Coordinates of C-alpha atoms in Angstrom, one line a residue:
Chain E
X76 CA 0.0 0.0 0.0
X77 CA 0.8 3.5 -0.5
X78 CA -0.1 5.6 2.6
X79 CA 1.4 9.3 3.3
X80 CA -0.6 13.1 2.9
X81 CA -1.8 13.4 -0.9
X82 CA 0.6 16.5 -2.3
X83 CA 1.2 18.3 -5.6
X84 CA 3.8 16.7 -7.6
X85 CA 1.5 12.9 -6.9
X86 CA -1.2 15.0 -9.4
X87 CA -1.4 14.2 -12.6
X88 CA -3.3 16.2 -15.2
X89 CA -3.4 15.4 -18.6
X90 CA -1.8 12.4 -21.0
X91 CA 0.8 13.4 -23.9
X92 CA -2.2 13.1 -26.0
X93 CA -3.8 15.3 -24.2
X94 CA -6.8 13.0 -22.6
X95 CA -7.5 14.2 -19.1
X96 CA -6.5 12.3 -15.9
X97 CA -10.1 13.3 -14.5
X98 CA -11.5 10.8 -17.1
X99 CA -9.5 8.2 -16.3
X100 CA -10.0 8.4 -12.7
X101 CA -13.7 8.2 -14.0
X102 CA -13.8 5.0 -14.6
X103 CA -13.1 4.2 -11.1
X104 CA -15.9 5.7 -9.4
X105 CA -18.6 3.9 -9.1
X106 CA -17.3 0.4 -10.8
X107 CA -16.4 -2.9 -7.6
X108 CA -14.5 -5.6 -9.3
X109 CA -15.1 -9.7 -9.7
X110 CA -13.1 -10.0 -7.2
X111 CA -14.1 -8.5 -4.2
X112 CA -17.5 -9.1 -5.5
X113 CA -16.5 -13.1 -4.9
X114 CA -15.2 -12.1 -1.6
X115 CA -18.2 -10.5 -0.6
X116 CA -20.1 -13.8 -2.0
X117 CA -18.2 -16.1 0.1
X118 CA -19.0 -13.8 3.2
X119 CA -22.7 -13.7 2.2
X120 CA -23.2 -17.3 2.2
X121 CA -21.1 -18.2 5.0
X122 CA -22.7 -15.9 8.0
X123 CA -25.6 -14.5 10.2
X124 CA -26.0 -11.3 11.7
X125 CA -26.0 -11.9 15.5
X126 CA -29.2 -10.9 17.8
X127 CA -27.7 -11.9 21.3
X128 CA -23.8 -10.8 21.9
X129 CA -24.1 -14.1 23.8
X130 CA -25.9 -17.7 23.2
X131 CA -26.4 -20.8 25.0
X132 CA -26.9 -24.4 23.5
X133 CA -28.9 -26.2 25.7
X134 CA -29.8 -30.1 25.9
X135 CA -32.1 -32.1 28.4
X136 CA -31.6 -36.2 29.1
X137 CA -34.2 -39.3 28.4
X138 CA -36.8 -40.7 30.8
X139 CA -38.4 -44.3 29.2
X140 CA -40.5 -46.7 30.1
X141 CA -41.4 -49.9 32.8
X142 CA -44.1 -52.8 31.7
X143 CA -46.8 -52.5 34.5
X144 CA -48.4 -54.6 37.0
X145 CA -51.7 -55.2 38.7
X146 CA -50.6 -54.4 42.0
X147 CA -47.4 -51.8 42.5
X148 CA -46.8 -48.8 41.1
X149 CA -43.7 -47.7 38.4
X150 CA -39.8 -46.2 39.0
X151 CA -39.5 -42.5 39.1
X152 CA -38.5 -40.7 35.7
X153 CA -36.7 -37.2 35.8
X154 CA -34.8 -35.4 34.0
X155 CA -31.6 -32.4 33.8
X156 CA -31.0 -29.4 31.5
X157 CA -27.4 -28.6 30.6
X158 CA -26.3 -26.4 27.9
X159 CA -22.6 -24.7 26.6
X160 CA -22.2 -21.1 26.3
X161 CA -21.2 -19.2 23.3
X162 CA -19.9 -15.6 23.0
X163 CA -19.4 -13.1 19.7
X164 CA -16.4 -11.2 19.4
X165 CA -16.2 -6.8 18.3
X166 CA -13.4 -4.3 17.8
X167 CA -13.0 -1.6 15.9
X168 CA -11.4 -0.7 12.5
X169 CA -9.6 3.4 11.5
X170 CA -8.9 4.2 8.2
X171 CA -7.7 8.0 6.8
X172 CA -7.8 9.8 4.0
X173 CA -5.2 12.9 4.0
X174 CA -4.5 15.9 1.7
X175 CA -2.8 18.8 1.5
X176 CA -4.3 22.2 0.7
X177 CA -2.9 22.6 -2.6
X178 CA -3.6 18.7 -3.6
X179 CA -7.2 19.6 -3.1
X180 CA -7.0 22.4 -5.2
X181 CA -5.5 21.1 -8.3
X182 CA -6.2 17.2 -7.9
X183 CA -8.7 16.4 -10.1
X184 CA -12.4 15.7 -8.4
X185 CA -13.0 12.1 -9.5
X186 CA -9.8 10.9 -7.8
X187 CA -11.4 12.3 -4.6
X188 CA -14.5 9.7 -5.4
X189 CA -12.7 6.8 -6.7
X190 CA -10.7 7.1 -2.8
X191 CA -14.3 7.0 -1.4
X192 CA -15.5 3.6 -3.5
X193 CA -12.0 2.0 -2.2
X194 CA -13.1 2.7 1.2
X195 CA -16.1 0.8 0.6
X196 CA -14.1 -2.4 -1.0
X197 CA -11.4 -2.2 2.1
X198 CA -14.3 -2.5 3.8
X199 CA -15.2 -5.9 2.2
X200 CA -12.0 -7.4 2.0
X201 CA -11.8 -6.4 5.9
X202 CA -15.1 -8.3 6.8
X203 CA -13.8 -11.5 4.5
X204 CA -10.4 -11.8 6.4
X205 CA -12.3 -11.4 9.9
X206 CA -14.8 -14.2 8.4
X207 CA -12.4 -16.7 7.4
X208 CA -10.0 -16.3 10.1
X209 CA -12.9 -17.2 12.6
X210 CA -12.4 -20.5 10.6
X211 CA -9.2 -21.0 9.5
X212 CA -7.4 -19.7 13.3
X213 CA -7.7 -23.0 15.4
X214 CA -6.8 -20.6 18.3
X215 CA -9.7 -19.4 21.3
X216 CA -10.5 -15.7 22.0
X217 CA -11.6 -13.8 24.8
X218 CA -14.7 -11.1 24.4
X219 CA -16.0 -8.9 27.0
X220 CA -19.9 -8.4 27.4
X221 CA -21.6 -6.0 30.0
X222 CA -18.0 -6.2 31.6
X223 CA -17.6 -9.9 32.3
X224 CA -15.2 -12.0 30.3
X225 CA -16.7 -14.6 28.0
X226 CA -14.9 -17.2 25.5
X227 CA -15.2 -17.5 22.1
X228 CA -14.8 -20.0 19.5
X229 CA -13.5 -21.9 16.4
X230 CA -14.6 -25.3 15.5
X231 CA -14.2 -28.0 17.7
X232 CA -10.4 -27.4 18.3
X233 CA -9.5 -30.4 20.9
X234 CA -10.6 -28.1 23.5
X235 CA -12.2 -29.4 26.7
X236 CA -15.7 -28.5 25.4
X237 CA -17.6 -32.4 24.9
X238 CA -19.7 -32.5 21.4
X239 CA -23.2 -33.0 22.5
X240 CA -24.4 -36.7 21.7
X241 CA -26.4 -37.1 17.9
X242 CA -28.2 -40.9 18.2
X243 CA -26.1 -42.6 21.2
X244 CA -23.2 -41.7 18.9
X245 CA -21.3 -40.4 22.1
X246 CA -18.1 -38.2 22.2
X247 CA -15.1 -36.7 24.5
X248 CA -12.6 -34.1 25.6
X249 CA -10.1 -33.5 22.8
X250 CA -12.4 -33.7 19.9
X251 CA -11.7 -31.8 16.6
X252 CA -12.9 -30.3 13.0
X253 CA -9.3 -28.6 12.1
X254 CA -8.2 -32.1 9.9
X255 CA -4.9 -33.1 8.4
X256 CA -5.2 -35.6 5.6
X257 CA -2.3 -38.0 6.0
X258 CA -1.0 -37.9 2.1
X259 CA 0.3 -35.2 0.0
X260 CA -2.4 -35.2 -2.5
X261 CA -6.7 -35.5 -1.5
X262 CA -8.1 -39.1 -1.5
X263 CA -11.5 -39.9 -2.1
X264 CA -11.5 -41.2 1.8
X265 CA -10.2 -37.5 3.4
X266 CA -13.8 -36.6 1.6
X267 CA -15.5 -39.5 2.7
X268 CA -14.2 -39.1 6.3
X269 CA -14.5 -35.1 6.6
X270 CA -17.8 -35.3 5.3
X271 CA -19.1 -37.9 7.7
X272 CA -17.0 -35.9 10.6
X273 CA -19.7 -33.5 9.7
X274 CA -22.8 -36.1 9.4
X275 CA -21.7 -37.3 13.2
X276 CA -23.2 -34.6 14.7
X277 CA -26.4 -34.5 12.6
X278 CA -26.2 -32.4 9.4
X279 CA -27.5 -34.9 7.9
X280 CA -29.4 -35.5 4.2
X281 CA -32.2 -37.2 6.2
X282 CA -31.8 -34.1 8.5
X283 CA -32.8 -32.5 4.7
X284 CA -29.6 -30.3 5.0
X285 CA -27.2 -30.4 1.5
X286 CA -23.1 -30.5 2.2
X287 CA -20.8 -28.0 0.1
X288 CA -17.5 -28.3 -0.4
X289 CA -14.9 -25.2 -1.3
X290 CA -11.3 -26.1 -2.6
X291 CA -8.6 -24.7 -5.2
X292 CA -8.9 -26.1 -8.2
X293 CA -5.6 -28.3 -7.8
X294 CA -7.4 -30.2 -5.5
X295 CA -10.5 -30.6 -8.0
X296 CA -8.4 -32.3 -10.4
X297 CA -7.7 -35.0 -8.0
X298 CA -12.2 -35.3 -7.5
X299 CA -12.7 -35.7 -11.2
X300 CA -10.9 -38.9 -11.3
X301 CA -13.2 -40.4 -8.2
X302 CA -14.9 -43.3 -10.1
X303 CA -16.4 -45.6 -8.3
X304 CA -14.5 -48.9 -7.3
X305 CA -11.3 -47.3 -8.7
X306 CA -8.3 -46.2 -6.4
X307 CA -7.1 -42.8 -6.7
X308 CA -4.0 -41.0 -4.6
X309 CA -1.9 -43.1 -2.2
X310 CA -3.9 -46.6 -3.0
X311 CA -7.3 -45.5 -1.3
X312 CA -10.3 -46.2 -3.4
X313 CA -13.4 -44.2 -3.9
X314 CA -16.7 -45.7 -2.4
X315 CA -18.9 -43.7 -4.1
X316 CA -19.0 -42.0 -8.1
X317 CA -17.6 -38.6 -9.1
X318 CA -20.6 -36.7 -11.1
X319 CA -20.3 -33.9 -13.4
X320 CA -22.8 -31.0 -12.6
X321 CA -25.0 -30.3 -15.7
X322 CA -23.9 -28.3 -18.1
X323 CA -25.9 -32.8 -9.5
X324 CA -27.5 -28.9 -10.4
X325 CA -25.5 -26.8 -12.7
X326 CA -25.1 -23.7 -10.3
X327 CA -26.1 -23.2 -6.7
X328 CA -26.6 -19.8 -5.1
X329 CA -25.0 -18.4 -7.8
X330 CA -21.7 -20.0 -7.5
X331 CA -19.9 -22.4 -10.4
X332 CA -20.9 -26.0 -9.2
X333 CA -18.7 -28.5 -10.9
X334 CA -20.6 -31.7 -9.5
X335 CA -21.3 -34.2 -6.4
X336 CA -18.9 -36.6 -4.8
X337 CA -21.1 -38.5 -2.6
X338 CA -24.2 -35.9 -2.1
X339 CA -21.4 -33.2 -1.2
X340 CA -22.0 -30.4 -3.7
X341 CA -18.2 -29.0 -4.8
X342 CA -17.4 -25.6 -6.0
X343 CA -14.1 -23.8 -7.1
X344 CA -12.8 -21.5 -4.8
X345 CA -9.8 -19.2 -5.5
X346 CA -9.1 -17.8 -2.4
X347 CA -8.6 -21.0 -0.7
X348 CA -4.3 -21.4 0.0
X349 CA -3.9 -24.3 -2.2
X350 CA -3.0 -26.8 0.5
X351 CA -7.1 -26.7 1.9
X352 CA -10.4 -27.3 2.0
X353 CA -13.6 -26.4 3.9
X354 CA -16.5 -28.7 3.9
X355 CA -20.0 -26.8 5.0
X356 CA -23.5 -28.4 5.9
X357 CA -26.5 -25.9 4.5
X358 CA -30.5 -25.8 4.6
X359 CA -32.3 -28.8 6.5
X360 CA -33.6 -28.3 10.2
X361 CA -30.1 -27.6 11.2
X362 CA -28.3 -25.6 9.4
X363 CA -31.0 -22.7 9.0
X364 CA -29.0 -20.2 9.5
X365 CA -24.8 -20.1 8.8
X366 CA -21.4 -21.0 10.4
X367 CA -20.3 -17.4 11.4
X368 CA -22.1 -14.9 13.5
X369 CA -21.1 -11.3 12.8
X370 CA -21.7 -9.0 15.7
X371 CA -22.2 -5.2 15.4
X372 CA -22.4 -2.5 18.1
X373 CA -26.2 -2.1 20.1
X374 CA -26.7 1.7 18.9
X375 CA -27.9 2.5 15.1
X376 CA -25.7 5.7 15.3
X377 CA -21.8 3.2 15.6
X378 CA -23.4 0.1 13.3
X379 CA -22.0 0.0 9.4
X380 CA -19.5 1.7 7.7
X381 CA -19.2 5.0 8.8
X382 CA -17.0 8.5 8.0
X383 CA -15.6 10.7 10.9
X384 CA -14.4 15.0 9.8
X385 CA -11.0 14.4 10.8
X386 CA -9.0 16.5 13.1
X387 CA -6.9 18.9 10.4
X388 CA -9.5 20.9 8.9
X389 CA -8.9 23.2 6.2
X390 CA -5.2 24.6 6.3
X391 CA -2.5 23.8 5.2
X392 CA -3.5 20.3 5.9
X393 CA -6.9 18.1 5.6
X394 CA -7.7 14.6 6.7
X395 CA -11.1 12.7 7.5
X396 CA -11.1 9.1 9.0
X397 CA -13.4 6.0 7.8
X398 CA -14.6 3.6 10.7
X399 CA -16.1 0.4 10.9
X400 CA -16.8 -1.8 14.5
X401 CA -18.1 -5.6 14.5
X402 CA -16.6 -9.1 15.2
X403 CA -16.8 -12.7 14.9
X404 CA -17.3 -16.1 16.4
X405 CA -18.6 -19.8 15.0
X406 CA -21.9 -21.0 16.8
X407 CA -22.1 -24.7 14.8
X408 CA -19.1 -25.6 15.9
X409 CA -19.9 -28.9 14.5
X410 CA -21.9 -27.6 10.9
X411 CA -18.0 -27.3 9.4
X412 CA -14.6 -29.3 8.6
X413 CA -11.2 -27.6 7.6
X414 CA -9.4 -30.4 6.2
X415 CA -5.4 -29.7 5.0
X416 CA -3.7 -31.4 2.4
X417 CA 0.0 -32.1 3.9
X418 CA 2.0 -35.3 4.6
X419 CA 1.8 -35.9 8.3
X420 CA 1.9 -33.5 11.6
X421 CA 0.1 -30.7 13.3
X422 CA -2.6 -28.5 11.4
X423 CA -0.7 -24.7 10.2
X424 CA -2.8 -21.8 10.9
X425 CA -2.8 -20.2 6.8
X426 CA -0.6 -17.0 7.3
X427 CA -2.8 -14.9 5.4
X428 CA -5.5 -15.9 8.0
X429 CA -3.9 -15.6 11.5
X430 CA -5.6 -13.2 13.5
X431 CA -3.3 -10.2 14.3
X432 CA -1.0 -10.7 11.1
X433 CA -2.5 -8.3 9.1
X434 CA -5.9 -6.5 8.0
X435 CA -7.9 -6.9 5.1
Chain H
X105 CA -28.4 -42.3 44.6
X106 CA -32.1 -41.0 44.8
X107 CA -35.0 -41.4 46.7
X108 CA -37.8 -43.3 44.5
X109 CA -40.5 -44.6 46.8
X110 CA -41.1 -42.7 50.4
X111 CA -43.5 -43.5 52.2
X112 CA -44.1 -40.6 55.2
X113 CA -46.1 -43.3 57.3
X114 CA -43.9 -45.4 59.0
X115 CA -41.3 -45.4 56.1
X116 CA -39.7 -42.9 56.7
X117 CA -39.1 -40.2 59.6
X118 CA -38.1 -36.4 60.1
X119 CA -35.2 -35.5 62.5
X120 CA -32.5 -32.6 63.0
X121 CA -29.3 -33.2 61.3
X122 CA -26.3 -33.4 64.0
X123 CA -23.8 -31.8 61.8
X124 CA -23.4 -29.5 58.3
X125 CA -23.3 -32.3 55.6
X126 CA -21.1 -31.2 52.5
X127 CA -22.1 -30.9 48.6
X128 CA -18.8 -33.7 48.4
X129 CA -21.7 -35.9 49.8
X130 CA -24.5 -34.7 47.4
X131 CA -25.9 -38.0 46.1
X132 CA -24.1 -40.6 47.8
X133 CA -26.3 -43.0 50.2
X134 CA -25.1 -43.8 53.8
X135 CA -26.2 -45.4 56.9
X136 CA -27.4 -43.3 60.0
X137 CA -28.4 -43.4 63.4
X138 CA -28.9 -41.2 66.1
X139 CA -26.6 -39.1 68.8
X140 CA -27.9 -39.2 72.2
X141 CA -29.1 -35.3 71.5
X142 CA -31.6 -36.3 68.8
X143 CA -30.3 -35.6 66.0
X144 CA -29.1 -37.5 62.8
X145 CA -25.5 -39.3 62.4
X146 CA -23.7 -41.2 60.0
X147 CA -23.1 -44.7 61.0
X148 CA -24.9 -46.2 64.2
X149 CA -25.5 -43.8 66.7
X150 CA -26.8 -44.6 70.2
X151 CA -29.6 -46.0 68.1
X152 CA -27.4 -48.4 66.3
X153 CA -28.5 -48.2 62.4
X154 CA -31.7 -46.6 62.4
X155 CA -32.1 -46.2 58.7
X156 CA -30.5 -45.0 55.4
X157 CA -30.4 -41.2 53.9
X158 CA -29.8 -39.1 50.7
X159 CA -30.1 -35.3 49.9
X160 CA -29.2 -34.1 46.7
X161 CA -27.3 -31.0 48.0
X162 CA -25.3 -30.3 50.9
X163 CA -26.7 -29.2 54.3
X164 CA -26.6 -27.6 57.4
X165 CA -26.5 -28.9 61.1
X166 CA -30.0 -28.5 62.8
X167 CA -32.0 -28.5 59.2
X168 CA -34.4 -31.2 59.0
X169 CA -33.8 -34.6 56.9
X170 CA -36.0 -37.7 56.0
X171 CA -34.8 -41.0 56.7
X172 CA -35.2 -44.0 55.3
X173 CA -36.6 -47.5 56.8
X174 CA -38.6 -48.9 54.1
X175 CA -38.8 -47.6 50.4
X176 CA -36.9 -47.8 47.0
X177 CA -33.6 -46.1 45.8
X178 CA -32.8 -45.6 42.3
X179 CA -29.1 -45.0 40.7
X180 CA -27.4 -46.7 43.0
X181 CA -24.7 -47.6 44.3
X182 CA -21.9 -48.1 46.9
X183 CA -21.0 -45.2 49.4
X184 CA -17.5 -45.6 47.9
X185 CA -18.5 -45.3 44.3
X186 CA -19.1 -42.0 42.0
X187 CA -22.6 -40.8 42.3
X188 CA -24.4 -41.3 39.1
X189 CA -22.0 -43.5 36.9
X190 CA -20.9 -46.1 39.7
X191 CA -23.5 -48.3 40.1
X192 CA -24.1 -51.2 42.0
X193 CA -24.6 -55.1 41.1
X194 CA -28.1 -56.7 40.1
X195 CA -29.9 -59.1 43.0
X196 CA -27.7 -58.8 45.9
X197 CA -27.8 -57.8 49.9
X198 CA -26.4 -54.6 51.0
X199 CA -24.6 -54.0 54.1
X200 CA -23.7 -51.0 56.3
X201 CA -20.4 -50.6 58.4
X202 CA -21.4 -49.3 61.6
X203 CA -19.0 -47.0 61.8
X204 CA -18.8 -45.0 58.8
X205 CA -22.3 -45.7 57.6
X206 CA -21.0 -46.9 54.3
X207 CA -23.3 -49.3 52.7
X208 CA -21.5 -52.1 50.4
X209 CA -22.5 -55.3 49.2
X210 CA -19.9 -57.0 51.9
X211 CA -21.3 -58.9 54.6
X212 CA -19.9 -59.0 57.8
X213 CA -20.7 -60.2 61.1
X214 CA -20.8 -56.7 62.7
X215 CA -22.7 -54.2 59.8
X216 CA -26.6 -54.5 59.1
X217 CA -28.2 -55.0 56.3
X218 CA -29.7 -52.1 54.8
X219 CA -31.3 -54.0 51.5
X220 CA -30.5 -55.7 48.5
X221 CA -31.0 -54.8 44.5
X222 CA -33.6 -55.4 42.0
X223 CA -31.5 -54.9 38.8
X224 CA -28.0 -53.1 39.0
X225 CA -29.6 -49.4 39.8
X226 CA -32.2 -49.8 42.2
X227 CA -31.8 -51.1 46.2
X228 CA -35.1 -51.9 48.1
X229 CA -34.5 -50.3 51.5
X230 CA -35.5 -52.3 54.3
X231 CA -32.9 -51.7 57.7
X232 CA -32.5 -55.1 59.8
X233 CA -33.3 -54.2 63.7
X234 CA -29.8 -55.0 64.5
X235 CA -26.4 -56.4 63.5
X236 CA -25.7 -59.5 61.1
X237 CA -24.5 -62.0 63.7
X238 CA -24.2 -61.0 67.4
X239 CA -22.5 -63.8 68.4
X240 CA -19.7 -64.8 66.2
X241 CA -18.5 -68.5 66.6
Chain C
X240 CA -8.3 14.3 42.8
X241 CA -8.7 11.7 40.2
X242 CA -7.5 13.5 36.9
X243 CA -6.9 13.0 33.3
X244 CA -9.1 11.5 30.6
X245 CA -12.2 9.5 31.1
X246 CA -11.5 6.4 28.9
X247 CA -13.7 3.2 28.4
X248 CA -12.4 1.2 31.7
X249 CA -13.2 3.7 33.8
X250 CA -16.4 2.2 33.0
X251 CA -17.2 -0.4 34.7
X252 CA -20.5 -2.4 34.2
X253 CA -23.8 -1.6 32.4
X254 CA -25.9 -3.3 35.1
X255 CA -24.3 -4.9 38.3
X256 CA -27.4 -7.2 40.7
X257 CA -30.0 -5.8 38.1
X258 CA -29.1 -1.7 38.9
X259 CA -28.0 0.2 36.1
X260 CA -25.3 2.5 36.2
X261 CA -27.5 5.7 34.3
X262 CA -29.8 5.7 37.4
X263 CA -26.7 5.4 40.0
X264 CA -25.2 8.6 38.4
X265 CA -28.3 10.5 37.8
X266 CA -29.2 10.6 41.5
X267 CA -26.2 12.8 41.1
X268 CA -27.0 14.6 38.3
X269 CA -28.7 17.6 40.0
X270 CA -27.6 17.6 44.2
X271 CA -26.5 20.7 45.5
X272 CA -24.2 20.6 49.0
X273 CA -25.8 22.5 51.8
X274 CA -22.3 23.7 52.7
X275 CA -21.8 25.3 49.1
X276 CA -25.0 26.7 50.2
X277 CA -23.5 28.5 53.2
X278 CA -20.7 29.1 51.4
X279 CA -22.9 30.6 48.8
X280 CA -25.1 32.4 52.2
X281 CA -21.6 33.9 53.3
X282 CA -20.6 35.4 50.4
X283 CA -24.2 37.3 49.6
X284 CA -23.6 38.5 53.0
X285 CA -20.0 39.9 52.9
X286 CA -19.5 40.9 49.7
X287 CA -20.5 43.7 47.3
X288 CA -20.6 44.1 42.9
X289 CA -18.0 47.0 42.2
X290 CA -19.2 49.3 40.1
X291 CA -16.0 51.6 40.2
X292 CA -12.9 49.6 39.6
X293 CA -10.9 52.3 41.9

């Protein structure tokens, strides 16, 4: 990035053949690119706007039955709520804009609005980072809420928080959704196991819910060769059939579906650091609302995107500031698997995605 | 442990606890009896055994308890065992040590029986008026 | 005296046992001391507006 005040001598006015840099800076106005248009997709499919800073998961036991008797009378049946609590992160994000006196005079006026629609895709590509680093970060945060410290959450992280039971499927301390495949190159069973790490803990296609599945396209031309009965990387063999989307549906949401393995819908994602892939349950009775919460503040006047006058006014020296406040934590901790594609070890937090290394 | 079937008449009866019971205790089933003041004692009092008790929390010296002489208990099991995962064996006497009021399924010529189990979880209460054998060979 | 500026920390809860902290500082919001009322009382009896400076 550039940064610094705006001056005289960064003005440009005209081309050697004499077209006007006003008309160039134009162009830039009003225009947002592919790109942070399929950043902004990613975020819109992938969260909820929060309603309580704070939520709890409760879950109640099983009474049963005795067969009965002429005289005598039955055992006692009770039972005991429990539930885990779940918190939403917030902080707040500064940007500027500075010029001097004589940049504002001569600079030409559509470079003044094209700095004003670049606030506005900073303010996506800030939103997407804090999204997928709730993900991709396997490391718990700490968020304040009427003054009183609460936790908050990726995935399942082997973490001392116990999965609550699906069927009598049953689980422990130290249970996880960050993944590492075991083999350089996807298999057909990292699908087949991620997906049913997912289907464990319900999100299930009797549950009427559909998985997704987003992954760089190196990764997708290991899928296309999953035919059934046939092995694929490091001698596994694929239990189910590879099919090509038409054209499984063509398109969902709007997004490039290139076809099903098992009922998992999978779609290109560019993004994605090539070494990984995140698997997502949608729809059904569970997964009626996303992965992601995003939290804003309480008060209308301090929610979106918002400009500040600055603090330098007029003379010789102008600036104004840009803010935005919200933040982020998973709820489903179960509705999502990050699965990595390395040889053997512990699971590497992607550096573009580690919370504190950078901003959008 | 839990209290399943109480019956206030004859069953059971009220009396003052002798001394503040801790939530450590929540759960777990022991034998009582009671100090020559009155009031309610683990193990055999002056009494000797005079039935069996539960509460579900801990509690304070000189608050009032139900005790147990004839009824049914359900998740059950030894004093020594976990409350609620530790559960005792299907069809078999219980016994209380006298001293300690802990209720296991040892015999012994000096405890008294406190009941035996119909199915792992659940011990039909019914205290013996005294000691197994009160004269050992 | 407690000094310098009033930063987010030196608040402290928005409700603490159901209370909130508006009403605890708006039973403050309009007291007057009945010894700056003296004071006031002493002044308005021992002083005088001057009119010519010398």
């Amino acid at each position: 990035n550039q940064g610094g005040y705006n001056t005289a001598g960064d003005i440009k006015y005209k081309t050697a053949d004499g077209v006007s840099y006003d008309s160039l800076w134009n162009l830039f106005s009003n225009v947002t690119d592919e790109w942070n248009k399929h950043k902004s997709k990613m975020v819109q499919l992938m969260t909820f706007p929060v309603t309580n800073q704070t939520e709890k998961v409760p879950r109640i036991g099983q009474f049963g039955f005795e067969k009965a008797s002429e005289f005598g009378v039955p055992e006692s049946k009770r039972t005991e709520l429990s539930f885990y609590q779940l918190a939403y992160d917030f902080e707040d994000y500064d940007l500027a804009f500075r010029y001097t006196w004589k940049f504002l005079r001569d600079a030409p006026s559509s470079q003044i609005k094209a700095y004003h629609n670049q606030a506005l895709q900073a303010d996506a590509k800030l939103i997407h980072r804090k999204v997928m680093e709730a993900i991709f970060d396997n490391r718990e945060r700490e968020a304040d809420i009427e003054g009183l410290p609460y936790k908050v959450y990726p995935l399942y992280n082997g973490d001392n928080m116990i999965p609550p039971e699906y069927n009598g499927t049953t689980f422990s301390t130290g249970h996880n959704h960050y993944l590492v495949s075991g083999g350089t190159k996807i298999d057909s069973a990292d699908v087949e196991m991620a997906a049913d790490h997912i289907r464990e803990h319900g999100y299930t296609e009797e549950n009427g819910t559909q998985l997704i599945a987003f992954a760089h396209k190196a990764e997708i031309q290991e899928v296309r060769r999953f035919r059934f009965g046939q092995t694929n990387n490091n001698s596994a063999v694929a239990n189910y059939d590879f099919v090509q989307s038409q054209g499984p549906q063509s398109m969902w949401k709007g997004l490039r579906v290139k076809g099903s393995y098992d009922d998992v819908l999978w779609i290109e994602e560019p993004t994605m650091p090539a070494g990984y892939v995140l698997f997502l349950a949608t729809g059904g009775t569970l997964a009626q609302q996303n992965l992601v919460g995003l939290r804003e503040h309480e008060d209308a006047a301090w929610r979106g995107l918002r400009q500040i006058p600055g603090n330098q006014t007029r003379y010789p020296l102008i600036d104004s500031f840009y803010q935005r406040s919200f933040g982020t934590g998973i709820r489903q901790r179960g509705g999502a698997v990050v699965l990595q594609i390395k040889a053997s070890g512990t699971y590497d937090i992607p550096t573009k995605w580690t919370n504190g290394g950078g901003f959008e | 442990a839990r209290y399943d079937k109480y019956n206030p008449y004859g069953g059971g009866f009220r009396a003052p606890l002798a001394a503040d019971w801790t939530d450590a205790d929540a759960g777990k089933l022991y034998a009582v009896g009671i100090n020559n003041v009155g009031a309610v004692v683990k193990g055999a009092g002056q009494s000797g055994v005079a039935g069996v008790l539960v509460l579900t929390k801990g509690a304070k010296a000189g608050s009032i308890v139900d005790v147990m002489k004839f009824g049914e208990v359900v998740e059950f099991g030894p004093t020594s065992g976990t409350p609620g995962t530790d559960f005792g064996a299907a069809g078999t006497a219980y016994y209380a040590d006298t001293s300690t009021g802990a209720i296991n399924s040892t015999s012994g010529e000096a405890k008294v029986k406190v009941g035996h189990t119909v199915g792992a979880q659940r011990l039909i209460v019914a205290v013996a008026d005294g000691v197994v054998d009160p004269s050992p060979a």
